[PDB]
Amino acid sequence: SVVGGLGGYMLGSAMSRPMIHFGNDWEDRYYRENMYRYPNQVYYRPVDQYSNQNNFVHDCVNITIKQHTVTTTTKGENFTETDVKMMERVVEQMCVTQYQKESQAAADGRRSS
């Protein structure tokens, strides 16, 4: 068992829903129709072995957007580029906070910070 079949990733716990405003008329309703479908939790690898938060977020969004995209079509969840491009944001806003929770016992000290 490795968080669902990953290269040594882990899973925190259920996050908040962000407030994403694409400025649109369809995207706002799109977002409001899948706000609870979207992955309330995000996968990550340990910030200890990162450089910046950037790469961490790159792959913490991306690995969520592979895992939650494949392992959810069991319920018929069929996230196209349209849902994926929302997840890129949704999971980013969550993942920023995620690093602020995992860095705590990892890179909270050891970022000279």
Side-chain angles (χ1 to χ4, degrees):
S1 313
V2 188
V3 79
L6 250 308
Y9 292 63
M10 302 131 297
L11 176 279
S13 281
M15 311 286 273
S16 189
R17 294 174 194 159
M19 52 244 69
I20 306 212
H21 61 172
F22 299 89
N24 215 286
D25 196 82
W26 68 266
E27 292 174 312
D28 208 69
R29 172 179 81 224
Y30 205 81
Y31 178 73
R32 96 180 189 234
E33 90 90 57
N34 32 57
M35 57 162 73
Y36 39 66
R37 284 166 162 176
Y38 283 139
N40 56 192
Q41 298 152 236
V42 312
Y43 309 119
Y44 51 100
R45 253 205 275 187
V47 57
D48 279 297
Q49 51 77 70
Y50 275 82
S51 308
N52 304 297
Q53 175 171 330
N54 242 125
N55 12 36
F56 176 100
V57 173
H58 302 173
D59 205 45
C60 165
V61 184
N62 177 85
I63 295 291
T64 297
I65 288 172
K66 84 179 286 179
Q67 278 290 284
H68 161 91
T69 310
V70 72
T71 210
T72 316
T73 323
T74 269
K75 296 198 287 179
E77 264 54 291
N78 59 311
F79 306 136
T80 51
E81 293 212 81
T82 310
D83 264 306
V84 157
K85 76 174 256 177
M86 300 229 149
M87 288 124 75
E88 271 191 295
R89 303 265 187 246
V90 147
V91 180
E92 171 195 292
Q93 302 309 347
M94 288 188 278
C95 190
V96 170
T97 298
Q98 194 69 79
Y99 181 103
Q100 301 173 358
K101 318 215 299 77
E102 47 101 53
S103 199
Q104 183 215 267
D108 181 88
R110 63 143 281 177
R111 197 68 196 287
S112 307
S113 189

mmCIF file of all heavy atoms in Angstrom, residues 50-81:
data_model
loop_
_atom_site.group_PDB
_atom_site.id
_atom_site.type_symbol
_atom_site.label_atom_id
_atom_site.label_comp_id
_atom_site.label_asym_id
_atom_site.label_seq_id
_atom_site.Cartn_x
_atom_site.Cartn_y
_atom_site.Cartn_z
ATOM 1 N N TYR A 50 12.484 18.161 -1.305
ATOM 2 C CA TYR A 50 12.234 19.153 -2.349
ATOM 3 C C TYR A 50 13.286 20.252 -2.348
ATOM 4 O O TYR A 50 14.160 20.316 -1.478
ATOM 5 C CB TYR A 50 10.803 19.698 -2.263
ATOM 6 C CG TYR A 50 9.846 18.788 -2.995
ATOM 7 C CD1 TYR A 50 9.353 17.636 -2.363
ATOM 8 C CD2 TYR A 50 9.512 19.047 -4.336
ATOM 9 C CE1 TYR A 50 8.510 16.749 -3.047
ATOM 10 C CE2 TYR A 50 8.655 18.171 -5.019
ATOM 11 C CZ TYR A 50 8.152 17.008 -4.387
ATOM 12 O OH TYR A 50 7.365 16.122 -5.050
ATOM 13 N N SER A 51 13.240 21.091 -3.381
ATOM 14 C CA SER A 51 13.969 22.342 -3.438
ATOM 15 C C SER A 51 13.063 23.441 -2.876
ATOM 16 O O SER A 51 13.315 23.956 -1.787
ATOM 17 C CB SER A 51 14.376 22.629 -4.887
ATOM 18 O OG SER A 51 15.047 21.527 -5.487
ATOM 19 N N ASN A 52 11.995 23.771 -3.608
ATOM 20 C CA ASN A 52 11.091 24.877 -3.323
ATOM 21 C C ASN A 52 9.719 24.292 -3.030
ATOM 22 O O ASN A 52 9.471 23.116 -3.304
ATOM 23 C CB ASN A 52 10.972 25.805 -4.549
ATOM 24 C CG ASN A 52 12.304 26.335 -5.046
ATOM 25 O OD1 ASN A 52 13.011 27.050 -4.344
ATOM 26 N ND2 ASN A 52 12.681 26.022 -6.272
ATOM 27 N N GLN A 53 8.779 25.137 -2.604
ATOM 28 C CA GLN A 53 7.379 24.744 -2.666
ATOM 29 C C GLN A 53 6.917 24.557 -4.122
ATOM 30 O O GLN A 53 5.983 23.795 -4.345
ATOM 31 C CB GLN A 53 6.503 25.730 -1.873
ATOM 32 C CG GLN A 53 5.015 25.391 -2.038
ATOM 33 C CD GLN A 53 4.071 26.171 -1.136
ATOM 34 O OE1 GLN A 53 4.397 26.582 -0.034
ATOM 35 N NE2 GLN A 53 2.866 26.445 -1.594
ATOM 36 N N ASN A 54 7.530 25.205 -5.126
ATOM 37 C CA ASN A 54 7.060 25.143 -6.497
ATOM 38 C C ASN A 54 6.954 23.706 -6.987
ATOM 39 O O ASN A 54 5.844 23.258 -7.233
ATOM 40 C CB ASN A 54 7.931 26.016 -7.416
ATOM 41 C CG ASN A 54 7.118 27.136 -8.041
ATOM 42 O OD1 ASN A 54 7.451 28.310 -7.932
ATOM 43 N ND2 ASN A 54 6.029 26.801 -8.689
ATOM 44 N N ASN A 55 8.068 22.978 -7.104
ATOM 45 C CA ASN A 55 8.086 21.596 -7.587
ATOM 46 C C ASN A 55 7.125 20.718 -6.792
ATOM 47 O O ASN A 55 6.366 19.956 -7.382
ATOM 48 C CB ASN A 55 9.483 20.929 -7.664
ATOM 49 C CG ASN A 55 10.693 21.588 -7.011
ATOM 50 O OD1 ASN A 55 10.636 22.203 -5.950
ATOM 51 N ND2 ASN A 55 11.870 21.376 -7.580
ATOM 52 N N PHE A 56 7.159 20.808 -5.463
ATOM 53 C CA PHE A 56 6.178 20.189 -4.581
ATOM 54 C C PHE A 56 4.760 20.423 -5.086
ATOM 55 O O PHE A 56 4.053 19.442 -5.285
ATOM 56 C CB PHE A 56 6.372 20.663 -3.138
ATOM 57 C CG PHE A 56 5.326 20.141 -2.174
ATOM 58 C CD1 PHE A 56 5.625 19.049 -1.346
ATOM 59 C CD2 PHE A 56 4.068 20.770 -2.067
ATOM 60 C CE1 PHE A 56 4.688 18.624 -0.395
ATOM 61 C CE2 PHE A 56 3.144 20.352 -1.094
ATOM 62 C CZ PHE A 56 3.463 19.294 -0.234
ATOM 63 N N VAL A 57 4.341 21.672 -5.297
ATOM 64 C CA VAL A 57 3.010 21.995 -5.795
ATOM 65 C C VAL A 57 2.832 21.426 -7.202
ATOM 66 O O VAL A 57 1.799 20.809 -7.430
ATOM 67 C CB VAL A 57 2.731 23.510 -5.699
ATOM 68 C CG1 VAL A 57 1.414 23.926 -6.375
ATOM 69 C CG2 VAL A 57 2.620 23.943 -4.227
ATOM 70 N N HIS A 58 3.804 21.558 -8.115
ATOM 71 C CA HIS A 58 3.705 21.024 -9.479
ATOM 72 C C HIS A 58 3.232 19.571 -9.413
ATOM 73 O O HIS A 58 2.264 19.186 -10.071
ATOM 74 C CB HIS A 58 5.048 21.028 -10.240
ATOM 75 C CG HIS A 58 5.815 22.303 -10.446
ATOM 76 N ND1 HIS A 58 7.080 22.365 -10.983
ATOM 77 C CD2 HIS A 58 5.501 23.548 -9.993
ATOM 78 C CE1 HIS A 58 7.531 23.615 -10.833
ATOM 79 N NE2 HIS A 58 6.601 24.378 -10.234
ATOM 80 N N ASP A 59 3.906 18.764 -8.589
ATOM 81 C CA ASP A 59 3.692 17.330 -8.574
ATOM 82 C C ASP A 59 2.572 16.951 -7.607
ATOM 83 O O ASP A 59 1.942 15.918 -7.782
ATOM 84 C CB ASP A 59 5.010 16.608 -8.267
ATOM 85 C CG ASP A 59 5.030 15.182 -8.823
ATOM 86 O OD1 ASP A 59 4.622 14.963 -9.990
ATOM 87 O OD2 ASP A 59 5.569 14.282 -8.140
ATOM 88 N N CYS A 60 2.256 17.781 -6.615
ATOM 89 C CA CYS A 60 1.144 17.584 -5.688
ATOM 90 C C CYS A 60 -0.198 17.910 -6.327
ATOM 91 O O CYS A 60 -1.229 17.317 -5.988
ATOM 92 C CB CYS A 60 1.382 18.481 -4.472
ATOM 93 S SG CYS A 60 0.045 18.827 -3.308
ATOM 94 N N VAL A 61 -0.200 18.831 -7.279
ATOM 95 C CA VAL A 61 -1.347 19.026 -8.123
ATOM 96 C C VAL A 61 -1.386 17.880 -9.127
ATOM 97 O O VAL A 61 -2.410 17.206 -9.240
ATOM 98 C CB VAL A 61 -1.310 20.417 -8.759
ATOM 99 C CG1 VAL A 61 -2.600 20.618 -9.554
ATOM 100 C CG2 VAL A 61 -1.262 21.532 -7.695
ATOM 101 N N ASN A 62 -0.276 17.606 -9.820
ATOM 102 C CA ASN A 62 -0.299 16.687 -10.943
ATOM 103 C C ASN A 62 -0.657 15.269 -10.504
ATOM 104 O O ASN A 62 -1.456 14.608 -11.156
ATOM 105 C CB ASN A 62 1.050 16.686 -11.662
ATOM 106 C CG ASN A 62 1.026 15.669 -12.792
ATOM 107 O OD1 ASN A 62 0.577 15.986 -13.891
ATOM 108 N ND2 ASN A 62 1.452 14.439 -12.552
ATOM 109 N N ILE A 63 -0.064 14.774 -9.418
ATOM 110 C CA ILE A 63 -0.294 13.414 -8.939
ATOM 111 C C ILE A 63 -1.720 13.261 -8.428
ATOM 112 O O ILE A 63 -2.339 12.218 -8.636
ATOM 113 C CB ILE A 63 0.753 13.042 -7.883
ATOM 114 C CG1 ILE A 63 2.153 12.988 -8.513
ATOM 115 C CG2 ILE A 63 0.408 11.760 -7.100
ATOM 116 C CD1 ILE A 63 2.309 11.840 -9.473
ATOM 117 N N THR A 64 -2.270 14.293 -7.801
ATOM 118 C CA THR A 64 -3.677 14.325 -7.465
ATOM 119 C C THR A 64 -4.478 14.224 -8.772
ATOM 120 O O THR A 64 -5.364 13.382 -8.868
ATOM 121 C CB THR A 64 -3.930 15.588 -6.635
ATOM 122 O OG1 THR A 64 -3.195 15.500 -5.421
ATOM 123 C CG2 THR A 64 -5.409 15.826 -6.342
ATOM 124 N N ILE A 65 -4.114 14.979 -9.809
ATOM 125 C CA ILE A 65 -4.828 15.028 -11.084
ATOM 126 C C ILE A 65 -4.573 13.782 -11.939
ATOM 127 O O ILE A 65 -5.292 13.582 -12.914
ATOM 128 C CB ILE A 65 -4.522 16.369 -11.796
ATOM 129 C CG1 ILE A 65 -5.275 17.467 -11.021
ATOM 130 C CG2 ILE A 65 -4.962 16.422 -13.269
ATOM 131 C CD1 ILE A 65 -4.921 18.883 -11.467
ATOM 132 N N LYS A 66 -3.660 12.883 -11.572
ATOM 133 C CA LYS A 66 -3.668 11.544 -12.145
ATOM 134 C C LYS A 66 -4.522 10.624 -11.277
ATOM 135 O O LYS A 66 -5.414 9.958 -11.790
ATOM 136 C CB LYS A 66 -2.239 11.080 -12.461
ATOM 137 C CG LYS A 66 -1.445 10.460 -11.309
ATOM 138 C CD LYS A 66 -0.053 10.016 -11.769
ATOM 139 C CE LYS A 66 -0.209 8.749 -12.600
ATOM 140 N NZ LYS A 66 1.061 8.227 -13.139
ATOM 141 N N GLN A 67 -4.306 10.596 -9.958
ATOM 142 C CA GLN A 67 -4.933 9.637 -9.062
ATOM 143 C C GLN A 67 -6.435 9.816 -9.042
ATOM 144 O O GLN A 67 -7.160 8.874 -9.341
ATOM 145 C CB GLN A 67 -4.395 9.779 -7.636
ATOM 146 C CG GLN A 67 -3.076 9.057 -7.433
ATOM 147 C CD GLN A 67 -3.250 7.539 -7.473
ATOM 148 O OE1 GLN A 67 -3.723 6.930 -6.518
ATOM 149 N NE2 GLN A 67 -2.930 6.907 -8.589
ATOM 150 N N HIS A 68 -6.902 11.004 -8.674
ATOM 151 C CA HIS A 68 -8.312 11.302 -8.527
ATOM 152 C C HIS A 68 -9.043 11.283 -9.876
ATOM 153 O O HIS A 68 -10.269 11.268 -9.904
ATOM 154 C CB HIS A 68 -8.432 12.643 -7.797
ATOM 155 C CG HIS A 68 -9.753 13.334 -7.925
ATOM 156 N ND1 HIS A 68 -10.840 13.229 -7.096
ATOM 157 C CD2 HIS A 68 -10.005 14.317 -8.834
ATOM 158 C CE1 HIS A 68 -11.697 14.192 -7.468
ATOM 159 N NE2 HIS A 68 -11.235 14.883 -8.518
ATOM 160 N N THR A 69 -8.324 11.227 -10.988
ATOM 161 C CA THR A 69 -8.894 11.248 -12.323
ATOM 162 C C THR A 69 -9.075 9.810 -12.752
ATOM 163 O O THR A 69 -10.168 9.454 -13.198
ATOM 164 C CB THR A 69 -7.995 12.136 -13.191
ATOM 165 O OG1 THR A 69 -7.803 13.346 -12.483
ATOM 166 C CG2 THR A 69 -8.517 12.574 -14.559
ATOM 167 N N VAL A 70 -8.085 8.947 -12.504
ATOM 168 C CA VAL A 70 -8.244 7.538 -12.797
ATOM 169 C C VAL A 70 -9.164 6.863 -11.777
ATOM 170 O O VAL A 70 -10.143 6.228 -12.162
ATOM 171 C CB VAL A 70 -6.865 6.872 -12.985
ATOM 172 C CG1 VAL A 70 -6.020 6.670 -11.720
ATOM 173 C CG2 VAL A 70 -6.972 5.528 -13.699
ATOM 174 N N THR A 71 -8.891 6.994 -10.476
ATOM 175 C CA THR A 71 -9.457 6.096 -9.454
ATOM 176 C C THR A 71 -10.909 6.454 -9.080
ATOM 177 O O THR A 71 -11.439 5.957 -8.082
ATOM 178 C CB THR A 71 -8.476 5.984 -8.261
ATOM 179 O OG1 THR A 71 -8.583 4.712 -7.641
ATOM 180 C CG2 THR A 71 -8.640 7.072 -7.191
ATOM 181 N N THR A 72 -11.582 7.307 -9.856
ATOM 182 C CA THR A 72 -12.867 7.907 -9.526
ATOM 183 C C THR A 72 -13.898 7.596 -10.620
ATOM 184 O O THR A 72 -15.084 7.512 -10.312
ATOM 185 C CB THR A 72 -12.653 9.405 -9.228
ATOM 186 O OG1 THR A 72 -11.515 9.579 -8.397
ATOM 187 C CG2 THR A 72 -13.791 10.122 -8.500
ATOM 188 N N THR A 73 -13.483 7.257 -11.848
ATOM 189 C CA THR A 73 -14.363 6.810 -12.933
ATOM 190 C C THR A 73 -15.114 5.507 -12.594
ATOM 191 O O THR A 73 -16.104 5.167 -13.235
ATOM 192 C CB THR A 73 -13.542 6.732 -14.231
ATOM 193 O OG1 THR A 73 -12.594 7.787 -14.285
ATOM 194 C CG2 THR A 73 -14.397 6.879 -15.495
ATOM 195 N N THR A 74 -14.744 4.851 -11.492
ATOM 196 C CA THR A 74 -15.538 3.836 -10.810
ATOM 197 C C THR A 74 -16.949 4.328 -10.478
ATOM 198 O O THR A 74 -17.904 3.577 -10.676
ATOM 199 C CB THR A 74 -14.741 3.399 -9.566
ATOM 200 O OG1 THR A 74 -13.950 2.305 -9.949
ATOM 201 C CG2 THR A 74 -15.530 3.016 -8.309
ATOM 202 N N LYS A 75 -17.098 5.565 -9.998
ATOM 203 C CA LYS A 75 -18.388 6.212 -9.777
ATOM 204 C C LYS A 75 -18.892 6.901 -11.050
ATOM 205 O O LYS A 75 -19.851 7.663 -10.997
ATOM 206 C CB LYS A 75 -18.279 7.202 -8.600
ATOM 207 C CG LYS A 75 -17.959 6.492 -7.272
ATOM 208 C CD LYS A 75 -18.260 7.343 -6.030
ATOM 209 C CE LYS A 75 -17.258 8.484 -5.815
ATOM 210 N NZ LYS A 75 -17.585 9.293 -4.618
ATOM 211 N N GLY A 76 -18.231 6.691 -12.189
ATOM 212 C CA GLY A 76 -18.523 7.366 -13.442
ATOM 213 C C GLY A 76 -17.841 8.729 -13.572
ATOM 214 O O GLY A 76 -18.122 9.429 -14.544
ATOM 215 N N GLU A 77 -16.973 9.132 -12.635
ATOM 216 C CA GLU A 77 -16.336 10.450 -12.654
ATOM 217 C C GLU A 77 -15.282 10.534 -13.753
ATOM 218 O O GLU A 77 -14.284 9.808 -13.780
ATOM 219 C CB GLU A 77 -15.747 10.780 -11.286
ATOM 220 C CG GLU A 77 -16.674 11.632 -10.412
ATOM 221 C CD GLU A 77 -18.080 11.062 -10.225
ATOM 222 O OE1 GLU A 77 -18.867 11.041 -11.198
ATOM 223 O OE2 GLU A 77 -18.460 10.722 -9.077
ATOM 224 N N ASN A 78 -15.555 11.438 -14.675
ATOM 225 C CA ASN A 78 -15.100 11.522 -16.035
ATOM 226 C C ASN A 78 -14.626 12.946 -16.292
ATOM 227 O O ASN A 78 -15.113 13.658 -17.169
ATOM 228 C CB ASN A 78 -16.277 11.123 -16.928
ATOM 229 C CG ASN A 78 -17.539 11.979 -16.777
ATOM 230 O OD1 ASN A 78 -18.019 12.226 -15.670
ATOM 231 N ND2 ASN A 78 -18.101 12.421 -17.880
ATOM 232 N N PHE A 79 -13.674 13.371 -15.471
ATOM 233 C CA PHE A 79 -13.083 14.691 -15.517
ATOM 234 C C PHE A 79 -12.331 14.864 -16.833
ATOM 235 O O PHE A 79 -11.317 14.199 -17.078
ATOM 236 C CB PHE A 79 -12.168 14.856 -14.307
ATOM 237 C CG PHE A 79 -12.838 14.583 -12.970
ATOM 238 C CD1 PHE A 79 -12.163 13.818 -12.004
ATOM 239 C CD2 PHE A 79 -14.147 15.037 -12.701
ATOM 240 C CE1 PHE A 79 -12.792 13.498 -10.790
ATOM 241 C CE2 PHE A 79 -14.771 14.716 -11.486
ATOM 242 C CZ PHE A 79 -14.092 13.955 -10.522
ATOM 243 N N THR A 80 -12.872 15.705 -17.705
ATOM 244 C CA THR A 80 -12.266 16.090 -18.968
ATOM 245 C C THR A 80 -11.214 17.167 -18.727
ATOM 246 O O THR A 80 -10.946 17.510 -17.577
ATOM 247 C CB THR A 80 -13.377 16.602 -19.895
ATOM 248 O OG1 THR A 80 -14.175 17.584 -19.249
ATOM 249 C CG2 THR A 80 -14.261 15.442 -20.336
ATOM 250 N N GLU A 81 -10.660 17.762 -19.789
ATOM 251 C CA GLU A 81 -9.777 18.917 -19.660
ATOM 252 C C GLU A 81 -10.431 20.069 -18.912
ATOM 253 O O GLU A 81 -9.738 20.856 -18.281
ATOM 254 C CB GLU A 81 -9.324 19.424 -21.030
ATOM 255 C CG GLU A 81 -8.424 18.385 -21.702
ATOM 256 C CD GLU A 81 -7.383 19.057 -22.589
ATOM 257 O OE1 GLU A 81 -6.359 19.520 -22.041
ATOM 258 O OE2 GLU A 81 -7.556 19.108 -23.829
#
